[PDB]
Amino acid sequence: IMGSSVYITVELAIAVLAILGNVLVCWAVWLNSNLQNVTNYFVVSLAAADIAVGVLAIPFAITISTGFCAACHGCLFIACFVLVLTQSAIFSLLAIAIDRYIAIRIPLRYNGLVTGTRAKGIIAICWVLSFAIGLTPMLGWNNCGCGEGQVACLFEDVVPMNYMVYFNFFACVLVPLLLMLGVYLRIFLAARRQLNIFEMLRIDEGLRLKIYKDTEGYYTIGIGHLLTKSPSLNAAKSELDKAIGRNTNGVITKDEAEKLFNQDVDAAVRGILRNAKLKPVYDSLDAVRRAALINMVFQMGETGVAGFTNSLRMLQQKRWDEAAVNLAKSRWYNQTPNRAKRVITTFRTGTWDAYRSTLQKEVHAAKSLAIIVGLFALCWLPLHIINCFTFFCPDCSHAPLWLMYLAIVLSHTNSVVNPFIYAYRIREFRQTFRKIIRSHV
Ligand SMILES: CCNC(=O)[C@H]1O[C@@H](n2cnc3c(NCC(c4ccccc4)c4ccccc4)nc(C(=O)NCCNC(=O)NC4CCN(c5ccccn5)CC4)nc32)[C@H](O)[C@@H]1O
């Protein structure tokens, strides 16, 4: 085993793997339209970046390890590309994470704030900013045996540490991690929230934090809390302040929406109790099943719920399974099956299972970010930690050599693992990949 021959061979194996693993991703999305959401637009960009490292950044990172003599700007150029090609991969990961953040926490505005048009504009940013940082030394932030105007072509020789540590590390690689981490937790915390009536109707009707026009052009906020039928947005905003009790500018917090929602629930219940046909059924239900009945009122109305004479009878007799089947035959179930299905299950079980199941999609995304952040940090932290010690403790006992180059190997391993791992974990790709493998191979 010659020391570095091993190192180069790994880098080349990564090149192939990086290329191959990434050639697949962009290919799948090409022929399957289910994978042509705005999100996979971000994916194809990352995949392409990770292809570019396999062809140019890898051979460059390798050729920066020989020490041949060449113009400082000609050897800096090479080190700058490998920097640039990697900056993009870092920022491209942000595009995916933040996209997954809004899709989970703010699903309504997703299509509004996240259009296929805008997305392509955000990638343009990620790529330009990558150039801005990687090519900073070429602007003048550099460090310039062999002859005049020729240095030993070595990374540290041409790239100072005050750039790698202060600017590159903290501003370009670290704040991703801290950001990408914040995404993981806040998504994670959303998938594991304690369930209740408020969250229940947030899933069926959707939560709104800014005033919006309902389906009939009446200003509404929260979960279907109408403000006024007046055609004046200023009038609607005024009414909001009356209920909130402060200056809102047309915007409220999540807690304020829950106080409006709670007031609305208290109102629906008082109406149910006035109904000679709904009060007997309402009293004979436990807390969770009462939330299911309130859900039907918030959708149809008391007189509309009262129409279910038979299904209301079985409920008071606690014939849960029998009431469910009868509710399945209603026009209400036929016009909105998804919501009615979750509501019926709540009647059957008296639990939040049907809605808890709705969050399985959330935890899938959470577990999928644990991996991206874990690998990303595992692959990037080592090499940069090494840079820091060299910069702050020159006289220290440097870490072992063979290990140093491994850290370099880890940084490049990110390009092949990170994009493919996200795709392969979301099965729609898996079926698409196998389809390609058998058909063309
Ligand atoms: C996120 C933005 N992008 C990147 O981070 C990408 O840029 C590359 N990179 C990023 N830091 C890199 C980096 N650190 C600095 C460098 C270093 C650190 C301390 C002291 C000297 C050099 C290092 C080299 C190897 C591994 C890790 C870091 N050295 C290289 C890069 O090729 N070195 C190879 C060419 N030099 C050398 O063998 N010198 C030798 C190293 C061993 N001896 C030592 C060691 C300790 C103390 C004294 N003498 C003598 C000089 N490449 C890097 C890499 O491709 C990353 O993915």
Side-chain angles (χ1 to χ4, degrees), residues 1 3-40 42-117 119-138 140-150 152-209 211-253 255-273 275-276 278-316 318-328 330 332-360 362-366 368-394 396-441:
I1 284 185
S4 68
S5 303
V6 149
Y7 158 78
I8 302 151
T9 314
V10 176
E11 294 289 325
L12 272 37
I14 265 57
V16 165
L17 297 168
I19 283 138
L20 302 198
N22 287 284
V23 178
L24 256 66
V25 178
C26 311
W27 202 5
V29 177
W30 179 22
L31 306 190
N32 194 336
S33 187
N34 298 334
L35 297 168
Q36 294 184 2
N37 49 68
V38 179
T39 285
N40 299 137
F42 292 159
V43 171
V44 181
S45 178
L46 175 61
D50 292 330
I51 292 168
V53 316
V55 175
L56 293 182
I58 287 277
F60 288 0
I62 298 165
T63 55
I64 298 160
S65 313
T66 49
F68 70 103
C69 310
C72 179
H73 289 69
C75 179
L76 180 64
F77 176 92
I78 303 174
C80 286
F81 262 31
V82 61
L83 281 163
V84 157
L85 299 161
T86 54
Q87 305 318 142
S88 171
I90 310 306
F91 305 147
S92 299
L93 290 168
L94 264 293
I96 308 185
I98 65 97
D99 181 7
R100 298 337 304 168
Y101 172 54
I102 294 180
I104 299 293
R105 171 62 185 185
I106 305 93
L108 298 169
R109 304 176 185 177
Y110 177 51
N111 297 336
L113 278 52
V114 189
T115 53
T117 300
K120 293 175 180 176
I122 282 73
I123 268 52
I125 293 176
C126 289
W127 262 104
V128 150
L129 311 191
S130 293
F131 276 87
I133 302 156
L135 296 195
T136 280
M138 299 285 274
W141 196 351
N142 43 321
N143 270 333
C144 54
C146 306
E148 156 69 328
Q150 266 194 349
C153 191
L154 242 56
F155 172 88
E156 70 278 10
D157 288 349
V158 305
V159 176
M161 304 302 296
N162 85 320
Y163 170 88
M164 288 304 310
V165 176
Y166 296 127
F167 196 59
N168 173 280
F169 164 88
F170 176 84
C172 321
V173 169
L174 178 57
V175 283
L177 174 73
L178 305 177
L179 263 48
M180 281 190 278
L181 196 288
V183 178
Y184 168 72
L185 295 178
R186 200 143 173 183
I187 285 183
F188 172 93
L189 300 165
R192 302 281 282 268
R193 61 163 74 83
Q194 190 166 4
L195 298 178
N196 61 336
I197 181 167
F198 174 66
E199 298 297 345
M200 183 198 193
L201 288 85
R202 174 176 179 191
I203 304 185
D204 292 337
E205 254 166 54
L207 176 59
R208 292 264 190 167
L209 304 156
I211 297 177
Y212 72 101
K213 286 192 180 182
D214 59 17
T215 61
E216 46 180 340
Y218 293 140
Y219 293 113
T220 300
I221 200 166
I223 293 129
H225 183 98
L226 180 135
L227 293 172
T228 184
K229 290 145 287 183
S230 180
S232 168
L233 177 67
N234 182 25
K237 288 188 183 179
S238 302
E239 301 292 359
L240 178 58
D241 281 11
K242 185 177 177 182
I244 306 298
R246 73 171 177 90
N247 225 340
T248 61
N249 297 4
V251 177
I252 60 168
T253 60
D255 195 324
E256 287 177 326
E258 188 166 18
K259 275 181 286 186
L260 284 172
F261 180 87
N262 289 6
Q263 296 289 328
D264 294 5
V265 172
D266 299 351
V269 177
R270 272 186 279 102
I272 293 166
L273 297 172
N275 184 290
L278 301 179
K279 182 179 182 299
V281 181
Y282 176 82
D283 300 331
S284 68
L285 293 166
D286 57 302
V288 166
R289 287 191 172 91
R290 286 181 177 176
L293 183 62
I294 294 169
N295 188 328
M296 293 179 67
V297 172
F298 277 137
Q299 176 177 343
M300 312 187 305
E302 311 213 335
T303 304
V305 180
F308 290 77
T309 303
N310 298 332
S311 301
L312 282 170
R313 155 167 149 268
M314 304 171 187
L315 289 168
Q316 185 164 19
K318 308 202 185 307
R319 302 160 80 177
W320 310 131
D321 299 320
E322 291 181 71
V325 179
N326 196 17
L327 291 165
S330 62
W332 160 67
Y333 180 88
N334 175 266
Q335 193 161 330
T336 58
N338 299 326
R339 178 170 182 178
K341 192 170 181 178
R342 292 187 295 270
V343 174
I344 290 168
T345 298
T346 307
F347 278 135
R348 282 242 283 178
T349 74
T351 67
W352 304 107
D353 294 351
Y355 292 78
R356 192 92 60 186
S357 306
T358 311
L359 305 181
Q360 277 189 3
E362 292 205 32
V363 61
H364 182 72
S368 291
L369 283 179
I371 294 171
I372 299 303
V373 179
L375 302 178
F376 179 86
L378 190 93
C379 294
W380 278 115
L381 279 174
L383 183 66
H384 289 282
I385 296 166
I386 287 175
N387 280 336
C388 290
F389 288 19
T390 296
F391 177 61
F392 299 113
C393 197
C396 268
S397 180
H398 52 279
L401 180 71
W402 59 277
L403 165 58
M404 289 193 159
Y405 275 64
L406 178 69
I408 285 177
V409 134
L410 295 179
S411 61
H412 297 110
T413 300
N414 172 281
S415 73
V416 62
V417 183
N418 210 284
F420 167 93
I421 270 292
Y422 179 86
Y424 191 100
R425 170 149 183 74
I426 300 171
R427 185 179 56 191
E428 216 287 349
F429 285 102
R430 291 188 262 175
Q431 302 158 206
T432 314
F433 293 168
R434 197 216 334 290
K435 179 194 301 173
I436 298 176
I437 298 169
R438 298 297 180 187
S439 302
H440 313 79
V441 179

